[model samples]
Each structure stands twice: as C-alpha cells, then as structure tokens.
Target chain A: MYLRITNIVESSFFTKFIIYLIVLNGITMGLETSKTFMQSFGVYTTLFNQIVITIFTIEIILRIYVHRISFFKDPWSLFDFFVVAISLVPTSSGFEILRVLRVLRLFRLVTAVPQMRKIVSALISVIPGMLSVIALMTLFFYIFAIMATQLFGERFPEWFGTLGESFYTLFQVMTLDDWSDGIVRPLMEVYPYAWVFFIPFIFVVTFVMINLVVAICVD
Target chain B: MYLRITNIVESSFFTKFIIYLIVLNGITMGLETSKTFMQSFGVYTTLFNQIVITIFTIEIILRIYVHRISFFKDPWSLFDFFVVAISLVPTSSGFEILRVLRVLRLFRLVTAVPQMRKIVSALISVIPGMLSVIALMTLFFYIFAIMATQLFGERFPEWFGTLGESFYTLFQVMTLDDWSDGIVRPLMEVYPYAWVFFIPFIFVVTFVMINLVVAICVD
Candidate 1:
C-alpha cells in the first residue's frame, strides 16, 4: 500500500543521515540556553548550520529524483518540497529567510517511516473530534477572559485587574491546571456576586473535560 | 434498566443534598487556602464543619435504612459509607481524622452523578492501555536515569549527578519545558559519553506520545 519512492527513501542511508542531523539538532536545541557552550562553540555554530543546509539540500534533490518529479501528486509532499526549496533562497539574494518553515522538514519523517506514518494516519482520524473540542475550549477561554476582565478589572489590578491578567488566567485553565481560584479569590472576597460569576468556569471545564471529551470517547 | 432500589437510592433528594455538600466543600477547599479569610472565619468555619457533620449523619442513617441488608454487597459502597460515617466521629470521640481520605468524599460524586460516572467508566476503559504506557514510561525513566546518572554524575553533579537528578530531568519533560541542557550542558562539557544517553529520550517522548495513545484511540 506504500508508495514506491517512499520505500526507496526508507532504504537510503542519506535519509538515515538526515534523521541523525535532525535528532542532533533536537538535542542541541536543549543546550542552547547554556552560556559557556555557546560562547565556546559560537564560531563553529554557523559552520554547523551551513553543513545542515547542504545536507538538507541534497536530501530534497534525492527525494525529487526518487519521486520522479511527480511530487505534486501528494499535496503534503509538494508542500514539503516547496517549503524546503524556499528556505534555500539565500537572505542575501533578496529572499525572506523563512527558516521557520524548515521545521516542516520533520514532516518527511512522518510520511516515510512506517510507525510514524501510522501515527499521522491515527491523528487524521481524530482530527475532527480534537479540533471541535479545541474550538470549544478556545471559545470558553476567551469568554472567561473577557467576562472576568470586565467584572473584576477594577477590584484586582494585577492578575484580574487587566486584560492581560484575564489572558493569564485563561491560559492557566487551557493547561488544565485550573487556577481559576487565583482569579476568583479577590472578587469573591470583595463581592459575593463574584462566585456566581466565576462558578461558570468550573461548570464549563468540568463539563467539557468529563462529558464532552470522555463521553464522546466511549461509544 | 436500573433496579428500583438503585433508582430510589440515586434519585433521593437527600442523596443529592449530600452530593451538593461535597461539591461545595471541594470548591470551597480552594477558598480555605487563604490565611486571612480562615483566621477571620475560624469560629464560623468550626460551626460549618459541625453543620456538615449534622447533615452527613442524617444521610448515612437513611443510606443504611435503604441498603441495610446488602450494605456490604458493593465493597466500595460500604467503604464509602464507612468513610463518610466515621468522618463524622468528632475530635471528642478520639477517632483519628483522615484528612486526605476526605478527598475521597468526591468519589460519592462519582457514583451519585451519571456524567461523572461515565467519565470514570471511560477512564476505566483506558486503564489497561494507560497502565501499559505508565509502566513502560516508569521503566524507561528508571533505565535512562541510571544511565545518565552514572555517565554524567561527576561532571554535572548538580543536575545529573545522581538518580534523583536524572528522575527530575525526566519529570520536567512531562511539562513540555525543556531542561535537557540543565542536565546535558554540564555533562557534555565534562563527559562526552553522556550525549549517547541523552538522544534516546527525545525519540521516545516524541515518537511514543504521537504513536501509542493516538493509535489506541484510533483503533
């Protein structure tokens, strides 16, 4: 059921080398915070990046060669190629770096590897459900933020006293940490009506988390 | 298709009163964390606890009258009954107050409500898969901890110097916050061999999260 070119891509040592580079980059990304290491290796960091660019360029060419220029048959594959291709256009050549798009290079792993391919397919199956749940959650987060900012903005000036505070509280719920009490406490202390106002969040999160997500998973 | 007795036990307003009390307690537990409020309301807080006890005693007696013959049939129900019953046993009675076990009072909410009941059931369905993944993660954490600790202990004695440090590093990954170099940076400076051990966790976390849980849901 797999594509012929992908089978060739899987078999190639160059593909494995690219995987090693990406993994190495992942490992180093964690270490970038260290002052000493960056200071010591600062000169060669650009050289390493150049090496990465050269390897990625070769990887893309080999992919097109194997795929027989029919890469556009798979939209995602074509998308991946164009992203890699655009990233190659030098900033000095009046092109936007768009180095952020290079992250799409990792998508090649999902398409090429059997196990990762299964994962992408599985994620696709759940996309409709997860997206809907995410949308609901986003709406709830925004509603709480706007309502709380308006209701309690005068009372609590730091965390709930402003639009930014509302954003932070909404963000805490999005993480499922449920620190709504931190937002609710001052209001509740000053005005009893605040509990009536703030309690809806408890209902929304508990309802969505338990009823909407969990029940939908059952049958 | 619920039994008549079961429906009576479930639909009884007294049962719901007990549930609302517990839910209120859970919500207000967060309120009790504030020192100033607790100090001001200490006398009222003590009065409220007694009121909660008075309410709890009446419900337990009714629960016993309703389910007397088959009280121990569902061991957990009997366990719940005993927990709620004994918690009312006052400080004067010399019963050791299990403060943590009070958290289990929320379990009554589990059995008393349909939606929470189904959330528990959905979680029950995922238990084996969850356990498998948990066990696998624990095993991996232990293995990587031991390996990173041994290799980097002397060099990065602050972060990966011991098993505790290694475990802490692994736990931080659960937060999706990268502290890898907090452990890895010093290690790489002193111990070159540590890099080999560091690469595996990146593969495991990224690959396993996407593949295992998503596959289980998809299937």
Candidate 2:
C-alpha cells in the first residue's frame, strides 16, 4: 500500500499538478493584497487559499508516507514542511503579521524548480568566501561609521549623529545609489576635505571589497 | 635601450617607489578637496601635486620608450596613460568638476597590485553573465514600475505617479533598504492588500532575481 501511494506521488503528472497548484496559490495570495480585487472576490480568494492549504497538507502527507522518517532528512523537504507548518498557524486579529507567512509558501518554487535549486546551491557554495568579505565589510562599516560620527555628528545629526545613523548612511553610500549628491556632496560643503574619507572609503568598500565578494562567489 | 628601461621600470624598488607616489598623490588630491587644508598649505600642496605629475609623466615616458606602440596594446598600460593624461587637464574655476577626476588616479593600484588586478579581471570575466542578469533586472523593473504606476499612481502620486518615479522607488525597494517602513507600511495604510503586490514583488526581485544574478556571476 505504501509503495503504491509513493509511486503515485512520484508520478510526473502529480508533480506537474503540484506546480500548477503552487502557481495558482501565488496568484490568489497576490489577489488578496489588492483591495479592489479582494473586495470583489474576497470569498473566492479565501476559498482558494483554503483549498491550496488542503492540497499542500495532503502532498506533505504523501511525501511522509513515501519517504517515512527520511522525509525530514532532505533540507529542501524540511524547508517545505516548515513553510507549510508555519502557514497552518492560527492567526487571530492580533496576529495579523502571521498572515504574511502565507506568501513565503511561494518560495517552494526554489525547491520545486530544478533551475532555482541549482542557483541556490551555487550561492551556498560561495558562503565561505562571502563570509570573509562580509567580515571585512562589517569592519569597514564600523571604522567609517565611527569616523563619520566624529567628523559630522555635530552638523549632520540626521545622518551622522549616532553610530547607528552613520552606519545606515554609510550603507547608502556603499551602494553608490546617490552617495555623491545625496551624502558626500552635502557633507563636503561643511568639511571640504570630507572626500578624503568618503572617496577611499567608497573605493575600498564598493570597488574593492564588494567585488571581492563577487569574485569569491564567481570563482 | 628599450630592454634597459624596461628592466629599470620592472625593478622591485622602482615599482615600490611608484606605488608610494601613487599613495601620496591620492592623499594630496584628497587634501585639495579641503578648503581648510589647502588654505593652510596651498603652496606646499601645489608643489607636491607638481612633483607627483612630473613623476607620473616620467614613468609613462619610460614605459612608452620600453614598450613603444606595444605599451598602448596592454589595456592596463593604456588605462595608466589615460588617467595620468586626465590629471593634466587644466582645471579652471569653470572646470572644478574636472578637478575631482584626479581622485581616479588612485585606481592605478588595480594594475600595480596583483591582487587588485585579479579581483578586477574576475569581475570583467563575469560581465557577459552580469549583462544578461542586468537585462532581466531592467525588464523586471519596467514591468513592475508600470504596474505600480497603474495601481498606485492615483493615490500615492509622490511614489508611483509616473513610470520613471515608480522605477526609482522600485529600485529602492529592490535594495531592501528601509523598504518596508519607508514605502510599504505607509502605502499599506491606504491599501491594506497592497502587500499582495509588494511582498511578492520583493520576493521575486530581492529573493529570486538578485540571487539569480549573483548565482550567474558565481557560475
């Protein structure tokens, strides 16, 4: 009986059906977020969500029946289980935030799609090198934030008044989003040589350090 | 004569001296940004700048004499020639922005330092893959921006009024920088189900798309 059910669950037709259900569930969740859509079809949206949950629960049961104790061994299986279990949590009015966890169900695609799995593994492979780069970046942020607070704390309290604010502002700078015109250019008006600190900080962090993370990941 | 000059240029001592001068010039260029520092030591700073420029010119001359037309063949050597040439551009008051370009001379370290060179080439190597990821990202941005404009334009004109503004705001969202509190939470007050659009958008862009870009570069 167990073997028969396991084989049935493993069938290509069943797999395709599950993928379709996941896609449909994603659309329903998105629909729930649209006020106009939800107001018009709130009942249907809730019904669709409940139906998805029921299918997911049965899918999890079939996997357990097939793999038995070993179903929990695979990390992806564990992730699938965890996400499904989290969604099952009863959300009272006060637990509205719990409702958000339902969206994470869509992330099952990472495990279900072979391409996504491959991409995720590639990322996992580079964690060691990425850690070192992250460490260096953290240190860079610490040193620069301290210096920025000392240099501009009195004048630009909004940006550099405290260590936390400096870190946040420095993070914005590292992304090169609008570092020049947004932050440094204004600070330069007060501390004319501020570029001395900010420019090299940018070079070291953005150009060199961030690239180090990319190189390690690529390598 | 070419071989003799090449040997001198390649010598460890000469290389170290040039690296030191590059570092020194970086400092002076930074100092030039400060009104206070330049005012205090304006003449000395000018003298230091002149010396550095002279040294750079001599180094380039030696390199050219040794490698002849081949000097320009090597991209790094050509990059060196370009940065130095840019520094020589006359920066009248009208061309103050051009003066800022002097800081770029610091990038010569990419050639002078073997480690920096390796990191840079690794980045260059990923350019083709990065381009594809960038193209996909741009497409994602356009699609979402249009959706945002259509969905939120009337209500949240400041953020999603026009396609261009939507693109910029979405870029901020993609960065995952204060996106929730800064944009989403505020917008959610008016449109409770807005999370359906945004949460999925964040998941797709930040979780899946950005990771795909990193994964491609890594692969």
Candidate 3:
C-alpha cells in the first residue's frame, strides 16, 4: 500500500496534510510582507519558501505520474500545477518582478478544502450569469471616467486628471465612500450641478449591482 | 373620467411628472450640501423646498382621499407615506435636527419607478435568505472586534481604542480598503505575527461575502 501512489494520494490525510504546508507557505510569504521580519529572518523565510516549493513540486509530480494525463482532467489539479510551475521558473535580472507571482500560492488554500472548493465553484458559476452585466458596468464606467476627466480634470487633477485616475476615483465613488461630502460636494462647490452627473453614475452602478444577484448551487 | 382621482393617481404620466419633481427635490437638497450654493441662492432653494413639499403634501392628500383608508395597501404606498410623514413634522431647537430627515425623500425615487420597485423588492427578498449568514457574520465581526481591541487597543488606540472604533476600522478592512498596506502592515511592524489574526479575519469575512450571493426575481 505504501509503495503505490494511489494509497498515498487517496486518503483524506493527504489533503489534510498538504493544507498545513500550504498554510505555512502562506504564513512565511506573509512574513515577507514586512521589512522588519525579512531584515532579521529573511534567510530562514527564503529557505522555507524553497523547502515548500520542493515539497509542492514533488507532490504534483507524484500526482502526475499516478494519474498520467488524467491529472489534467481536474481544473484544480491544473491550478496546482500552474501555480507550482510559476514558482519553479527562474527570475533573472529584469524578470525579477516575476517573484511576485509566488504569493498566489495562497490561492491553493481553496483547492485543498472541499467546502472552500464548493464556495469557489459557486462563485465561478456566478461569473457566467454576471458577464453581460459586468461588461455593461465596465463600459458604463469607462464612459463616466472619460467624461469625468473631461469635466473636472482641470480643477481636480489629483482625482480626475487622467483616464486611470478618473477610473480610480469613480471606483471609490462606486463603492459609496465619501463621494457626497468628500468628492462630489467638493466638486459641487465648483460645479454646482455635478450631482447631475454623480447621482446618475451612482444609479447606474446600483442597477448593475442589483442585476448581479445570482443563484449558486453550492453542492 | 378626467375629474376622477383614480384617473389622476393611476396614470403613467402622473408618476412620470411626480418623478421629475422628486428628482428636482433631490437635486435641490444636494445643492444644499454646498455652502457656496446655500450662501448665494439659499433663499431660492428654501422656496424650492417649500414648493416641492407643498406639491408632495397635496399629492399624498389626493392619494389618501381617493384610496380613502385603502391608501396603505401597497408597501410602496406606505413607504411614500412614511417618508412624507417624516418630512411634514415641524423642527425647532434640538428637533431642528429633524431637517435631516427630509433627505430621505430622495428614497422616493424607488417608490415612483416601477422598475426600481422591483429592484428594491429583490434586494428585500435577499434579506430573508441571508439572515442567518448575516447574523453569523455580525457575531464573527463582534468577536474579532473585541479581540482586536484587547490585543492592539493600547498601541493602535485610534483604530481599536473602543469597540465602536474597532467596528469602524474592521469595516474598513472588510471593504478591502487599504487594510493590507495602510492598516495591517503598520501594525505588523510592531507585532510581527499580527497576520495570524488579520489573515483569519480577512478569510472569515470573505467566507461571509461568498455566502451572500442570493437569487433575485426581477419581474
């Protein structure tokens, strides 16, 4: 039984076991978020990342050899493979930022848990239903962002100066964060009728939000 | 037939006309948000409010007379009544603060629009499906808030000094607004292992968010 990879991977303990490593890998990465910890113990954290990658690499290898091409049948397995592959790639001089990709290994936490997987499945299922509405919202935001830039860019360059900046500010408005007192009312001081534009932006986004409601089959 | 109150209240044009007034009322109230507008046209704006309220008062009176004790049959009708009733109340001295209640008249936008009423209905329906999960999230936030106050309250007094502050700060984190770099990382500088608590907080809130997906019947 120990000799066969089937027995090794078939048990609940295998999943339960790897989840801890994944979580530890997550913690060590989070540790790297701080400059202080990295200053004192960066070497150990780097070694921990190396060790976890080795374990993840071997774990996926065993699954591949055991399941053969069937390993690709499950999207979750492919996710694991893809994440692991990215971690294995060398980050040479200019590609140094590629190291940023390693943090996505935290996402592996969902694939390992049955309940979390169901939640993610439901979430993904929602994407299809919400596609048109989401795209509509994007276009709506694009139009509003462009218009906002053209309208207020000269006066409030910090918030609406450029396309990207307007999108960012508009998103903050979309989230209902102080748009009244902080953004819109201040703009209204200059453009007394800015709410004419702002309120409709809020209404259109609210419409999209209402349309986003979707039934999820979590089972 | 034109003389009938039923002809007045039941017509599409009536709602369409009233919606314009409601929108104008909303805009005028929004205008009051600006000190500059209030300074220059405060008198005109006051007159506008007086006129709109006179119209709203008459509209509700006509509905009550036509429907006669049956005016409250629809929830929206009651919503309109409640918002209007709040507005008609006199404010003096401390009760002058009641003037803030007039802003809720903006909510009438939903009651007048049939499509908006359906959206509100769907949103209300979601409340029932999400009740238990929402309660669970509240308790989870409560527990975490209390713990966070006790844990970091002294050092991070501004954010976690009191339960109210903790709840506010926690909500900002829940919204994914600068929680990582702005709030948590600063705290992490002092307490290296703070992610142990913060990450779990993020994870639990995320669990609740995923559960909040609900089906809405838009028709």
Candidate 4:
C-alpha cells in the first residue's frame, strides 16, 4: 500500500505537467516584459498570449486528470484548478481580476522544481530583514512628516496640505523627482527658509537611504 | 579546557554583537523595499540609517577593544573592520569605485540573523525551483529581445536601442509610466499601431512583476 502511494506521488506525469505549465508561464511573463518591442510583429504577440492561455488550459485539464476530480484535496491544487478554470471564464466577464490570479499560477512552478523554490526561499529568508528595514523606514517617515508639517505647513500648504499630504509629497520626492522646485521652492518664497525642510528630505533620499541600505547589506 | 573555551567563546559579547548586528542589518536591508516611501519625509528619514551606522561603528570598536592588538587573529573581524573603515572614506575622494564592496555590508545583516539566514537558506533550499524559473525567464527574454530587434528595429529603432535599454524602457512601463501622450502615444502616431507593441509590455510589468515578487513569500 505504501509503495503504491509512493509511486503515485513520486513520478506522476500529472504533477510534471503542472510543473511544466508554470515554467511556461514564467517564460511568457519574462518575455512579455518586452511588450513594445515584441508587439510590432502584431499577430505574433497575440498568438503568443493565446498560446500561453492554451497551454494553461491544457495544464488545467491534465491536473484534473491527475487527481481525477480529487485535486481539491490539496489547496494549491485547488488553486491551480481555479487558475485553469478561471482562464476559461471568458474575457467578456470583465472579471479580469480573476484573470490576474493567473500570475498566482507561477507558484505551481515552485512545486514543479526545487531550485526555483530556493529563490523563493531566499526571498523568504530576507523577510524579517526586509520588515525591520520597513519598520525603521516607517518610523523615519513618521518623524520626518511631523517635522515637515510643522516647519512648512503654512508655506507649502499645497504639498503639505495635511499630515497625509506631506507623506504623499515626501514619497514623490524620494522617486528623485525635483518637487523641491515645483512644490517646496514655491512655498519657500512665501514662507521661512523652506530650504531647511528640503535639506533633510534630500539628505535622507541621497545619503541616508544609501547608507542604511548598504550598511544593512554590508559584510 | 577545550569545552570550557567553547563555552566562553559562545557566550562572549563579541558573539552577541556579531549576531545582533547581523540580525538588525538583515531587518534593515529586508525593509529596503520601503526605502522609497521613507525618503519622502523631510527629516528623520535618515533616522534608522544613523542607527545602523552607529551600531556598526560601535560593533567595530568593541571588537577592536576585545581583540586588542591581536585583531588580525580573526580574519573576518579584520575584514569587517577594514570595510567599515574604508566605507567611511568620503565620496569626495573619488574612490566611489569601492562603493560596490558596500554590498558586503548587507551580507553581515544576513549572517547575523538566523531567520534572515533562513531566507537565504530557504533560497538555497529552493535553488532548483528558482533556477528553473530563471532559466526559463532568461530564455524568454533572449527570444523576445531578438524578436523585438527583428520586428521593431526600423520604425521604433529608438525604442529598440540595445537589449539593456529595451529592458529599462520595459521596466518603466512595468512601473506604470504609461504617459502615452508624452511617450508612447507620440511614437504610436509615428507608427500608427505601435500601441499594440506597448500593450504586452504593460501586461508583463503589471502582471508578472507582481506575481514574481509575491511568489517569493507565498510559503
């Protein structure tokens, strides 16, 4: 009994097909990364997307075959079942949100291979570290937002409209946008040295950001 | 005597520093994804950054103090000490070439935290799964780039530029810089149906990037 169960579990071609489907999706996603360049061929791009969908559909069918309708025993298998079934939901439903879950289909790839699982693992390994940095960053933003609001609330009222607005503007500046000119400079003209507020913002983005990131990653 | 040495060695503050620093830095780097948002605040943005640096500097000082003149006996410590010392060298020195070594700083964070270590371990754990995804993605990009070069090279030569440039533009679209009027729409006007090319590019970025990033933590 054990041997038979092991045999069914170990080398099942059905499992293999699900794995292959995910790999196919990964490749499609990666290549699709270059949509503008690729779509110039027109039909070729559409054909590729269709082909990928077809492969996924076939994968769905194969998965159903493998489990013989018992696939729902496993949650992920159930997920794959939905991905495959949802792919058939027709684009007309505008239930495109369901289609978005097709990306979740990539998890099937992780089950298919061990190495891809490692990249998954590395990312998992990095989470707390990621979170710690995130918490610290949040703390940093909160304090800075308070300061910017207090200093420039009267001046750049548009950018620092409220505590929340201050955060939104602060985020834009971090993207390397020279909002200082459009946002801060205009306010500085009417208010006190608005430049004082800008200095810390810029310093945090350029120097502190790099230092914190680099330091955490440093050997 | 050997066991006694081991006990002392295990409980040493030096070991505690190494471990704690590593865990905290790991948290710091892991949180790096949030750096974008944090940079927005005008002040206190560098708050955590300063904390990390101060902690690192203190660790180095403690190590040197513990090891006294015999610091060279521990090569890793010497290396860590050396990196911290050199990284302090201002960018004004034009020695920014050495900045690349700063990535090593991140390594310390990973090593210090077992949980962080686990993610790396997890990545290593999932190496086969990750690599398969990587290989497939590489193949996908290779085929797409070549096809893109072939189909769109003439009319959208600027868009096709080099493989690297193409990747960058694609990245921009993925990040949702779909300013077609300023960017794509004008290009489409010149080529008419070039928007067809842009669609998949957006799809890959919006759909694929999200899935791949989320997949890292799905377990």
Angstrom error of the Cα, residue B114, model 3: value is 41
Q: What fraction of the correct interface contacts does each predicted structure contain? A: 0.02, 0.07, 0.04, 0.04
Candidate 2 — which pairs collide? A33-B193, A218-B218
Model 1, residue A55: C-alpha shift (Å): 58
* TM-score, per-candidate, Cα-based: 0.46, 0.54, 0.51, 0.40
Worst window of 10 by summed lDDT in candidate 4 chain A: A210-219
How does chain B score by TM in each prediction?
0.72, 0.80, 0.81, 0.51
Flag regions of model 2 displaced more than 4 Å: A93-95, A213-218, B1-168, B171-219
Worst 10 residues of 4 chain B by lDDT: B202-211
lDDT of 2 by residue, B1-219 (tens): 778777999899998999998888878777888999987999898888878988998999887887788888988889999889888887676577667787788999788878898999887877766554464456456556756766787789899877678888998888766665577657877876676787668655754454566566546
Arrange candidates by TM-score, highest first: which order?
Answer: 2, 3, 1, 4
Error of 4 at B156 (Å): 16
Q: What is the TM-score of chain B in candidate 3?
A: 0.81
Provide i-RMS per model in Å. 11.4, 7.5, 10.0, 9.9
Ranking of models by DockQ? 2, 4, 3, 1
Name the 10 consecutive residues with the lowest summed lDDT in model 1 chain A: A176-185
lDDT of 3 by residue, A70-125 (tens): 88999999999998998888746555325765665766776776756765675566
Q: What share of the true interface contacts does candidate 1 keep?
A: 0.02
Q: What does candidate 4's lDDT look like per residue over B25-84, in tens digits?
A: 556655554867557642442466556666678767655555577877854456677777
Q: List the residue pairs that clash in candidate 1.
A: none
Chain A TM-score of candidate 2 vs. true chain A? 0.85
Q: What DockQ, between 0 and 1, does each candidate earn?
A: 0.03, 0.05, 0.04, 0.04
